[PDB]
Design a protein around this ligand. Structure first.
Ligand SMILES: [Cl-]
Ligand SMILES: [Zn+2]
Lengths: 243, 397
């Protein structure tokens, strides 16, 4: 049977944003395509290669846990970058997405060094960007979710799409997340994969093409996912007409 | 002043006191007496002090009321007993607060004993609580109720402190400990865990209380390990009131709570229950109640995202919805402002049962009366008020 291996980095206490729903969503959508997903939880980043890895996932946690995960992930900072530059698919949520750049500035000005895989920084404020967020993307279709983060990420890379309602990476850009090659990062909660099946299928489809296994069938039933998106889309437009 | 004259018209007055379990015991006593068509005077949890009990007798005194069942705060005992004298008095337990002045319980027990001294009051004391059995020095007619050793394994070690003998001040030796200071104690000064007149031999909570009191089975409709002592204290009062074992068995098997916590409903052969869940832990607990129920089930799960509930519904993917595949379920009715999140959660949980989406909490709750199975209602906080009102509306016998 076709098999895809997911490397869940820092599964042990980096699980604030549920994160098992992203694993559940990846496994269910791949199961509909007759693909068995093997999730390999990795907490020891010493001597681990990326040969048997098809997709990797890096969740988010508290500011203290992110620094501890950054130190452990730094032990393979170069082989991870070469995998991403080679086109390794990956999804990172919040802290895992913020700690891919150079540094993270807390509201008190304390700089915490990041992994440095990409050239960008994050500046946090007290007032958070909180509320429902609706995104219109060319690759991932309509992305719907909920944002709640104080850190403002500034990067000149490809984003997940334009923000029609909400804020996104910061107050002004009206762009959410990052999309560098096959690597994805976001601030969305829910999780993001359950409703946004087009993001799940993107990560699964890209891994299949790299491995050489069929991604069939490509179009499956998505009614439950679409009905969940429409609730927040209708609510976003209802509040949008008041502004 | 002239108010005590109302207390002389009633032949039997029952006081319920203690730190925990006053309301459950008082409701069990009053509900069983009302179910036997006995006219009684009964107060509530919000009126168990001097002014609250005084108002209770005025509003409810009729020439028919023969039994008075009222709960009272233990701090109000000296003030109340200056104007009221009851026939019997039951004490559930006494617990020191984590932050309670050293010996606060000992001084309080002594203050109650000097007030209830003599007065010929029938004291119904918990034999397993040493500070409750200390009150045996304030009367001559003492009735002990307790629980046999190894009758049940409680979640314990919440406080593992050492308690002193209320008679001599020495360290109490315990032969068996249920939890905290509740257990079988024996001090060589004479103070010991006395022999119990009414004793619970064994019980379990699956999903409700099933008690074995003096070789008799009681299938109740309330939950909680700690409610077993509160039900036995009610059993002791009712037995001393003349009710036989069968009359108490009828009232106990129909009483239930009224706050949406393991609350039970029944109309003809239709059975239903509601239990709030607002986090992954509470959800896994509410889903585990269904597996312990007999026959097919029909679910109503509500998920609002209001301010009191929080706007992040991510926690529903941390709960174990996949366990519903192990239960016989006719259909699952999802409701609330985020009902479609539940439907998507169940789809990803591979729960292959008919799912119905009805965003209105009232219309979705009333939809379960159309099914013959056991209804399991699981709302979050802001969904509890509309769901509980509809269940009370749909169950009127
Ligand atoms: Cl007064
Ligand atoms: Zn002693």
């Amino acid at each position: 049977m076709h098999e895809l291996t997911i490397y869940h980095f820092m599964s042990d206490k980096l699980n604030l944003y549920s994160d098992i729903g992203n694993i559940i969503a990846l496994r269910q959508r791949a199961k509909k395509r007759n693909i068995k997903v093997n999730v390999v939880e990795i907490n020891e980043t010493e001597g681990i290669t990326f040969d048997e890895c098809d997709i990797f996932f890096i969740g988010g946690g508290s500011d203290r846990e992110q620094a501890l995960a950054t130190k452990e992930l730094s032990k393979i900072k170069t082989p991870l970058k070469e995998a991403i530059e080679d086109g390794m698919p990956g999804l990172t949520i919040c802290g895992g997405y913020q700690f891919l750049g150079k540094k993270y500035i807390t509201p008190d000005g304390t700089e915490l060094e990041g992994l440095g895989i990409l050239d960008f920084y994050t500046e946090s404020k007290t007032n958070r960007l909180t509320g429902d967020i609706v995104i219109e993307s060319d690759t991932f279709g309509t992305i719907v979710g909920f944002e709640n983060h104080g850190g403002r990420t500034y990067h000149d890379f490809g984003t997940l799409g334009h923000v029609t309602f909400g804020y996104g990476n910061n107050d002004e850009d009206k762009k959410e997340g990052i999309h560098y090659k096959n690597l994805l990062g976001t601030y969305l909660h829910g999780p993001i994969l359950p409703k946004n099946y087009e993001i799940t299928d993107y990560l699964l489809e890209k891994a299949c093409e790299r491995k050489g296994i069929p991604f069939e069938p490509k179009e499956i039933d998505n009614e439950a996912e679409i009905q969940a998106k429409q609730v927040l889309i209708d609510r976003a437009n209802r509040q949008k007409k008041s502004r | 002043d002239i108010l005590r004259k109302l207390a002389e018209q009633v032949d039997d007055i029952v006081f319920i006191s203690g730190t925990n379990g006053k309301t459950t015991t008082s409701n069990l006593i009053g509900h069983t007496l009302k179910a036997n068509n006995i006219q009684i005077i009964h107060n509530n949890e919000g009126a168990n002090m001097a002014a609250g009990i005084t108002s209770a007798f005025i509003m409810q005194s009729t020439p028919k009321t023969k039994i008075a069942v009222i709960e009272i705060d233990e701090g109000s005992i000296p003030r109340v007993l200056k104007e009221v004298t009851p026939s019997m008095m039951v004490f559930t337990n006494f617990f020191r607060d984590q932050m309670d002045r050293f010996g606060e319980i000992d001084i309080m027990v002594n203050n109650i004993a000097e007030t209830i001294s003599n007065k010929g009051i029938k004291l119904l004391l918990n034999a397993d609580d040493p500070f409750v059995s200390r009150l045996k020095i304030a009367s001559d007619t003492i009735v002990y109720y307790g629980m046999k050793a190894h009758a049940h394994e409680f979640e314990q070690s919440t406080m593992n402190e050492s308690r002193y003998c209320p008679n001599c001040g020495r360290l109490l030796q315990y032969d068996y400990i249920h939890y905290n200071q509740i257990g079988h104690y024996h001090c060589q000064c004479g103070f010991k865990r006395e022999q119990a007149k009414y004793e619970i031999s064994s019980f379990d909570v699956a999903p409700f209380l099933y008690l074995n009191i003096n070789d008799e089975k009681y299938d109740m409709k309330i939950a909680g390990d700690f409610n077993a002592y509160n039900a036995l204290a009610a059993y002791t009062v009712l037995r001393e009131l003349g009710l036989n074992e069968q009359t108490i068995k009828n009232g106990f098997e129909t009483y239930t709570s009224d706050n949406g916590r393991m609350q039970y409903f029944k109309k003809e052969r239709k059975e239903a229950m509601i239990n709030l869940a607002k986090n992954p832990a509470g959800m896994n607990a509410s889903l585990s109640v269904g597996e312990q129920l007999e026959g097919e089930k029909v679910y109503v799960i509500s998920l609002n995202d209001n301010a009191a509930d929080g706007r992040d519904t991510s926690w529903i993917y941390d709960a174990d919805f996949e366990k519903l595949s192990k239960q016989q379920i006719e259909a699952i009715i999802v409701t609330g402002t985020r009902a479609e999140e539940l439907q998507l959660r169940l789809k990803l949980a591979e729960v292959e049962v008919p799912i119905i989406v009805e965003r209105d909490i009232y219309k979705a709750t009333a939809k379960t009366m159309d099914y013959k199975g056991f209804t399991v209602a699981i709302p979050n906080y802001t969904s509890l008020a509309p769901m509980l009102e509809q269940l009370n509306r749909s169950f009127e016998g």
